[PDB]
Amino acid sequence: EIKELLKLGDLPTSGQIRLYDGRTGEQFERPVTVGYMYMLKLNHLVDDKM
C-alpha cells in the first residue's frame, strides 16, 4: 500500500533518491532514504543546564 501511494504521487518506489553535496556539488555514491518524520522538542534545554 505504501508503494502504491508512492506511485500515485509519482515518487520512487524504493523510497530513495539521489542527493548532491552542498559544499562541492558532487553526487553521493549511493541512494539515500529521504522523507518526513514527526519530531518533538523535549523539556531538557541547555539554558537550564549550563
Binding site: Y36, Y38, L40, N43
Partner: protein
Amino acid sequence: KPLVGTGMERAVAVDSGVTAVAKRGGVVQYVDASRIVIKVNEDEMYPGEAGIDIYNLTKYTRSNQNTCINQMPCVSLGEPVERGDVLADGPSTDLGELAL
C-alpha cells in the same frame, strides 16, 4: 498535525479538556481572538431565555511547568456548529487533533 498518525489524536484532543467544545448547536454570532458567542438553535433552547452561549478563551497563561497555555479560535463568523464540535484549539492541538 502529525501527517502520519493512528486515529487516536481526536479522542485525546477532545477528552483532555484543553479545547473549547460546543455545548449546544447554533451559528457563530461573534468571533474574536479572545471570545466566541454562539446563537443557539431554537429547538435546543429552553423557554424564557436568551439563546446565546459565550466562551471566554485562555490567553497566555502560565502552567505548572512554566510553559504557555493559549487558545485560538478555529471557526469563522456566521458558520454553523453542532454540539460536540471544536471551536478553539488548545496548546498542541490542530483543528481538534493532538499535535505534539
